[PDB]
Amino acid sequence: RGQREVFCGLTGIIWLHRKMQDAFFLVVGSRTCAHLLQSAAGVMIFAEPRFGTAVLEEKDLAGLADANAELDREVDRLLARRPDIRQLFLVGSCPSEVIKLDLHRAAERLSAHHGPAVRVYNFSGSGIETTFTQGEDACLASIVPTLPATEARELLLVGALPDVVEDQAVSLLTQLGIGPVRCLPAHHAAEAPGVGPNTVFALVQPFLGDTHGALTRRGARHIAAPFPFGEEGTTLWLKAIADEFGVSAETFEAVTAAPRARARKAVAAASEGLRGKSVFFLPDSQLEPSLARFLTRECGMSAVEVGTPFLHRGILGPDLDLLAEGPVLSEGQDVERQLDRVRAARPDLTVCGLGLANPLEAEGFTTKWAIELVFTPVHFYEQAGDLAGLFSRPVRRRAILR
Amino acid sequence: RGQREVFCGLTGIIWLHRKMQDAFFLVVGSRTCAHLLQSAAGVMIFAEPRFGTAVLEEKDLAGLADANAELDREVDRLLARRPDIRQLFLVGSCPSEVIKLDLHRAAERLSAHHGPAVRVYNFSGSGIETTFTQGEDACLASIVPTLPATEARELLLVGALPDVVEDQAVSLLTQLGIGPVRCLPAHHAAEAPGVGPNTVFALVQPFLGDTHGALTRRGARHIAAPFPFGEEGTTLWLKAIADEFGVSAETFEAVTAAPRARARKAVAAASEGLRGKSVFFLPDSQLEPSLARFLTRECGMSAVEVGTPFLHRGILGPDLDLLAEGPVLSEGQDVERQLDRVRAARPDLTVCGLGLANPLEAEGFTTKWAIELVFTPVHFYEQAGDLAGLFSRPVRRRAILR
Amino acid sequence: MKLTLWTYEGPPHVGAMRVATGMTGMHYVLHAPQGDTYADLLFTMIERRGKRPPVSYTTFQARDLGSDTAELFQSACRDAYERFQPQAIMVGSSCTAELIQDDTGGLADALSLPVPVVHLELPSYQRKENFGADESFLQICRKLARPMERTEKVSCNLLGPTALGFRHRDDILEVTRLLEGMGIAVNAVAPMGASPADIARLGAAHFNVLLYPETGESAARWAEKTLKQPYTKTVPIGVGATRDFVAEVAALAGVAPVADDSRLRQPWWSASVDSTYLTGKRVFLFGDATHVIAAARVARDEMGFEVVGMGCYNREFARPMRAAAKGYGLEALVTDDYLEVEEAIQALAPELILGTQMERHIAKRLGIPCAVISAPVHVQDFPARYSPQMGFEGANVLFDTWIHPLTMGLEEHLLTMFR
Amino acid sequence: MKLTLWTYEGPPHVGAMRVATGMTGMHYVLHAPQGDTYADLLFTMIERRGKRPPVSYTTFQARDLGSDTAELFQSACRDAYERFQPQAIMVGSSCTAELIQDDTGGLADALSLPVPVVHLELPSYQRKENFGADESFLQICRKLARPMERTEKVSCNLLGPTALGFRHRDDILEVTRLLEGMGIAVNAVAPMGASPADIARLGAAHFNVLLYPETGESAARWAEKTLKQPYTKTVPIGVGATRDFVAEVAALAGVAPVADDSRLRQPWWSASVDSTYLTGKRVFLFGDATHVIAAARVARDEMGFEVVGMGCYNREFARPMRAAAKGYGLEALVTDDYLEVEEAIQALAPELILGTQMERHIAKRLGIPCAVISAPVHVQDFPARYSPQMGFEGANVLFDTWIHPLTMGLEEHLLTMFRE
């Protein structure tokens, strides 16, 4: 326990609003969180984004009713600019939590204010409570307790995925032939699907644990599977889906034979630079268990340590069973001690936080930064080769430069 | 006589290339003339323009018949490459003239065995015979041999007017009440004018001497008018045209009163910096007496001397007559002594070529480059203020920069 | 409670953090919620810094509040001294830490660390990043700098250059070259090349050279009173301002005004017939007041531009900006909102815009030439090459950077016309 | 014989005018027709000289032919001497005067001007511009440089920089600071920054530094043969090439190699995480052989790019081109025709193009990031700012200039993806 280098949960907004075109993320925060969003978004900021932060002033922090009134008036001015938005997302932030401004009661008031069309869900992405990719599932974990129930047994892809990867997953599941797919993150509120005890949810990203709890309360039961990182992980994911839906083994094998071979050749081409290398995982994105597994078996690499800001054993179970007994699983972060450890280990490649990436290069350690894996399509079969290339590239550049 | 700093006639090709869409300018010259065209065009060469150079090698120099054969082959290849070109212009050059390669006989043979679709003419742009804008004169005088002999009276505007200036002049003439108007540098061969004894022509440009001579042999008669550069000169040009067309003075004045007001206002808008200044003209573009008259009368700018490479008194008469007796005319070019003359005069503005502009500026002489008037649309009413601003801008910049 | 999409300045804790990373051997422990480490990678990315920034966040979470927050602060400062081994320490609080009842100075004083500790009080909601940097530099000077004996040779202090600043490194090099050509020796440069020992040497210089007033006015005035050091009121951006700065520095030191203008090319390249079209072009200027004032002077006098818009995002610099704008016959657009700037640009329609990154992107959407002259910049705007904005070679850099967009526009338009 | 619209190099006499403009007090008398004054002006704009290039033209016309051409040349040379008072004169012939049997040699000799006259023999139609500059510099060295007692200390000559050259002026300063840092004082610089006094002082140097082979190769070979001057074979473009040049020059001078790496920032910036996408970029390289070879080395070794194209328009440097291209697993493209280079670019489809201004325009039409590293340039490429291509500061400039188009395209693509 000590200093923790990881971004507060509002950073998950930057890739969430790309999935949700009718959602505006209205952050209730100070100047610091506004600066975080502006900096991280970087080039996004100059293309009229869907996230805006209402800065709290000293006259705003005093009291709650006045703060609620000013937030409501700000929402009205924004809705004047953007009548298209119908699912606003008030986002709790560190100073907003210290104010104890009621995002729940604000959600109720604003939902009553624009009942028929514009319905508002509030979640919290404050750094005191939420960190990095925990910003994403917390957003989804706020929609789930409010989506309508359904009475049809269906599969749903829980977790934000790029449109290309989403359509590829839908195509693969339709090739399986059994089970309709209704992705949980709805790009439009009119396209909102239904979730109930009839449905069954298969996780697609490892940081989604609050959504796990929300869907558990919804009545759907999880199907545990390796997460789609590499040919083999996505293969077991589809295998577990088929076993859940009773799809025959031979049909699944026939469907996946060619794309699995393509993904295998893709990872094999990129893993050559990584063959017989070492990796260190600094806990930032929570993606690290599955990534370490994929690099260990598909890419043939050795993992010194896999670090996690928060380790959910329940969902990461199967990916941990595939993962070897070699590396040490770390929960939480102590950046100074972890930095000393990676200096001691001298790994060939280090999947580390972005604030530490350049200093580690200065010290002489090749580094990879997981936030690009957060945005870049690295899921499922076709993008598995790209996923291998992402880790291959830093080592290749290190070899070329020196 | 002595050192001269006027470009050879190939530089007039680049703007004639712009005016004539159906004309290709094949220059039979050395690498020096190709470098001339490349340097002069600047950005234009990168836009695959219509001027190309058939660089003669040593074997081309040694063999006249061989040179003729490879010229024929080059034209066959060009015609195959560019089906759109309906008229092709062999441009004489200094090395070709020393070769004695008869480009006129070549043009006759080429038009004989490529016609009637492809019409092949010859004009000489060599510096040893043709200077700068006389290349435009050379081409426009080379076309008129092949023009049909008409029997219906026609007004023939002769000169490479800019398309916008061309349409303004055409509209202004048609609203005067004159008959049909034709333009000698027609964009297409089918659009080429007809010349006969009844046909009559007016010169928009002063350096069109050879055309003025050539059209006379076909029966056409010249209009004695000052060149329409700005404000009053345009009025005299249109009034002389009307007088030869029998258009009464009153209807003419009613027509031209509206453009005249804006022309006067535009001239006065930019002549304020020029008030109480002296101009010095170097012989570059045979335009100098006309802009000298414009500057002395309309802009009220003193003229110390007017320099022309070859002043044709016949066409320049009315403009010279309107020009004050005080300015003195310079015949020929000796830039070495002319620089001492410009140092003695110490003019506030020295119109010269691009070549001498920077060294004169370093000596404290504000400079204007005369090649810009042939490019920028500066004739007639609407562009009078543009020409005034064109002359005033260097003075303004020198004033600000101190 | 106005919603903010783009902020020209960050919170003051960022500004004070631009001082710690510039200084060598000065580490600062700052109370922040777990997740405020984003600002650390600004230097590692935007400025491309090999060194980890001297920031040791407490990173308190919702689990630890009350006395636990003070425990985290104490342990963070203890660990920072124990292993980071700074020569000096300064203490600050983020917005969230400021909001809670947290007293940065008390815990640090109770630790009684042998290295000096500088307690900063910054109102995070009232002020902005530039005030944070300025007031942090002021506190460091007040804590460490003492009125020490004057040097033998003429010594000048270069105050103002802080980390994550526009062209601060190359401008430092250019001004050092000018001062060496004068005969003056730079006693110390703070906070960019500073150390806690160097700040103690601030009393040694005969006079202070204030390169950037935003980060160095208050240190300059405090040194003027306590240390009896007079500071230069002119900033050497552009040829005219460079000559004025040379004259002022020669007057202060008493040295002879030896300025190598051999490097100079901007005046002659401006006076050429090529730059005739530059006459009368309309320019909109935004960004920090010093940069905008200097750029307006350069554009009007040396570049032959008509200063058509002028504004600054430093509300702290409202009066000099207004006076300068009245100099060119305009009103200063002192706004921190990009929307007011955008409305001014649309209603005003300049030919060229010089300003921040927001300024440049607004111009790109408006399809008119854009160049960057101010502090809010991207990673690409931080150059590996030697691109000073000050001095005689800075004049050449300014000329090339300003004329480059216009030349691209002219060439593209000519090509499109020719096709 | 062939239809040419774009020429990579001009006529051979242009290079001679480049050498004349580079040196002070040298006058070039050209037997050229009126209208060949076009090349006088490239210096006044593109190079932006405050003073007219020290060249004179006879400007003969149809009237001035036969013996009249000889009279015109005689009078022109005499007037040039009596007016400009140069310390030396060189006489040359253009294509038109090369066609006629007028001999510049006899006419220049008959005047018997006291200042030394240099006689230039250049085949205009067969040869090209760079050979013209090289031979002009060589003839000036032969007519002026003499065996001279060596300097007391270690002194070096910078050979190669001529007028109308790609960032020659800034390279002079960068290599000069490198030499002073290593402890070697520059004796003289030619052709740029030279006078007829300085050409005679070439014999006083301990060794020669050949910055640009295209215009300065022949002079260095002649100095080695007669002046006994060893010449450095390493062109210091890029960090690795700069260190190789520093080591070679330190060995030649005998002084310890001391180079200032504090200004260097390119290796660290290429080693940063921001430069990871640069890895594997395919680059096409065209232009003068030396600059392109050096740029290919820079790109492959520390920019991380893969060189999928290499070519030059210098026929005189075809062999070093084809030798260097083999080291990267390619055949070079030694051509002077823009259609061949365009077809090579289309076939290769590189992500980034480094080459002459024509290459930049070709990339712009094809929508490929472009940067300029080679001699044919416009006014725009000639900078007012300090933009060397040599040394460590030159390496920083190379990094920024090469990654600017890539980062610009990346930013545009990011904005297009973010909002349509």
Ligand code: PMR
């Ligand atoms: C934490 C703030 C921060 C800042 C200063 C920026 C700008 C910037 N962020 Mg972007 N970014 C930082 C990090 C992250 N950015 C985000 C996204 C993102 C990615 C995918 C990418 C990137 C990068 C960067 C960079 C490098 C500049 C760039 O390549 O354009 C800056 C300074 C950039 C890269 O190549 O990194 C090497 C790129 O591809 N950031 C996110 C949102 C989750 C974070 C937290």
Ligand code: PMR
């Ligand atoms: C004699 C050779 C020469 C060259 C190299 C060019 C290009 C070029 N000549 Mg001017 N120029 C010369 C003279 C003339 N130029 C001509 C054209 C022309 C124009 C339209 C323009 C110009 C100019 C120049 C320039 C400056 C390029 C610049 O503006 O960026 C070059 C090198 C340029 C200018 O002066 O800037 C305002 C400009 O507007 N040239 C013509 C074509 C008939 C001639 C022969």
Ligand SMILES: [Cu+2]
């Ligand atoms: Cu640009």
Ligand SMILES: [Cu+2]
């Ligand atoms: Cu560009």
